[PDB]
Design a protein around this ligand. Sequence first.
Ligand code: CL
Ligand code: CL
Ligand code: CL
Ligand code: MG
Ligand code: MG
Ligand code: MG
Length: 152
Amino acid sequence: TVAYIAIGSNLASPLEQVNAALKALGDIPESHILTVSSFYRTPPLGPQDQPDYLNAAVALETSLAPEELLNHTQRIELQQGRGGPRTLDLDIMLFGNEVINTERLTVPHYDMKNRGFMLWPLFEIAPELVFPDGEMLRQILHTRAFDKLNKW
Ligand SMILES: [Cl-]
Ligand SMILES: [Cl-]
Ligand SMILES: [Cl-]
Ligand SMILES: [Mg+2]
Ligand SMILES: [Mg+2]
Ligand SMILES: [Mg+2]
């Protein structure tokens, strides 16, 4: 089943952690990477001085159940997120065609249609994607205004 996972990091030199998280995703049992997006830059959300955020998206083929995949993403955050919090965020955006509303997991990710830093890398790797409700990703990006984010 093809899962789409968002990756974010707020480090000034995020590549080692991001790359380690990507390697780790590929090494999840019964899973492998399909496609890795470009890495995008987004500005911070508070007034104090801090680095920009890196954001990306990955297509991961997996035979695991969604909650199983969640457990691995949380494991990788703990193992590879050395810098603290926001230094490595892994979020399941979409999982096959499945709609999930459990305790631990909501799929499609509950805010992703509102977040350019999710949708732009996703569109790079899945330009023809259609959401469970029928909305085309391309349409969302052309009807909503989302700043075109630059390459990291
Ligand atoms: Cl690992
Ligand atoms: Cl491990
Ligand atoms: Cl939807
Ligand atoms: Mg593998
Ligand atoms: Mg998260
Ligand atoms: Mg709508």
